[PDB]
Amino acid sequence: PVRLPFSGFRVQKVLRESARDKIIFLHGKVNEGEDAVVILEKTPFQVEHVAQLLTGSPELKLQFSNDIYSTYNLFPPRHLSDIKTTVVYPATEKHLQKYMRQDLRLIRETGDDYRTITLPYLESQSLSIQWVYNILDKDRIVFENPDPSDGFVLIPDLKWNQQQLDDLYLIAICHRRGIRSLRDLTPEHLPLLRNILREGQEAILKRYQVTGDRLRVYLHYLPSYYHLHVHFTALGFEAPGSGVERAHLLAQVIENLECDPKHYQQRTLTFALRTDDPLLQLLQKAQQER
């Protein structure tokens, strides 16, 4: 008899849940007592399973019908209704904070906020980007413009298995050092930016036969690391951070610089931060003061 590594399960808290994604993250009390996190996720369908079920006399309860539309509760065989079950036991506070639904706040960072508050904060963290430099200094590179000022490398995202094009995701990392984000972009960077957009699209076209009009090509602000990089995703893939509150289309960044050379130093950029992110309180305090 296969068992969970504890006795009983009482829900203390729903940490996170998504009706959309058919997933729930539970903080349970067990062995009453101890903390455990249990994540339950309904499984995706396998078309062969479904095809075979629909010719095998499925157990159906009719809920509603009109002349052509009918809805049922289907009570499937067990290979369609298994639930992916992830267990963290015992769960620490770190685990509980990890799985807790994010609590985000928007901040509208002015040019002066960035200069006076954000930049100092980032410099105080000065997190390593040595992994970036390791890639640039050199097997996964799909395309490279080796120009040390206007060049870049293009690499598949680690999570893209390349088993399909639906979730195509590549990243361009510039060779040039010290361009921390959008905030550092000036017309000096236009050749670089244009190179990434043009040559990155050319590369993807030649390698995967995906045209540029099927790609969403963007930067994040705030970026996950502070060395300029560009996301190239399938337009049909609702990729990470492709929301308006984080993503900035490269073509539009370029045109923004063309139209206003000082755009990225002067304009207000809007982004989200977790409520426990120290930068959020620094920015909020600064904004309250003026």
Give the residue numbers marked as catalytic: 229
Amino acid at 132: V
For a second copy, the closer CB: 80 or 282: 80
Strand order from edge to edge, sheet including 169-174:
143-145, 152-156, 169-174, 229-234, 215-220, 247-249
**Distance between CA atoms of residues 169 and 139, nearest Å:** 17
- Is 1:46 a contact under the CB 8 Å cutoff? no
- In DSSP terms, 154 is beta-bridged to 143, 172
Q: In the set 50, 146, 186, 207, which binds a second copy (CB under 8 A)?
A: 50
Site residues (CB under 8 A) for a second copy, limited to 125-164: none
Site residues (CB under 8 A) for a second copy, limited to 209-248: 212-216, 218, 235-236, 238, 242-245, 247-248
Least distance to a second copy from the beta carbon of 197, Å?
11
- From residue 84 to residue 123, what is the string marking binding to a second copy with x (rule CB under 8 A)? xxxxxxxx---------xx-xxxxx---------------
Number of chain positions touching a second copy (CB under 8 A): 94
- Is 219:247 a contact under the CB 8 Å cutoff? yes
- Short-list 142, 145, 167, 170, CA closest to 156: 170
Does 225 carry a binding-site annotation? yes
Q: In the set 251, 279, 282, 286, which binds a second copy (CB under 8 A)?
A: 251
Least distance to a second copy from the beta carbon of 274, Å?
11
- Is 272:104 a contact under the CB 8 Å cutoff? yes
**Distance between CA atoms of residues 246 and 273, nearest Å:** 10
- What DSSP character marks residue 227? S
Q: What's the distance, CA 1 to chain centroid?
A: 39
Does 230 carry a binding-site annotation? yes
For a second copy, the closer CB: 54 or 141: 54
Site residues (CB under 8 A) for a second copy, limited to 18-37: 18-24, 26, 28
Q: In the set 45, 112, 162, 202, which binds a second copy (CB under 8 A)?
A: 45
Binding site feature residues: 131, 157, 159, 220-231
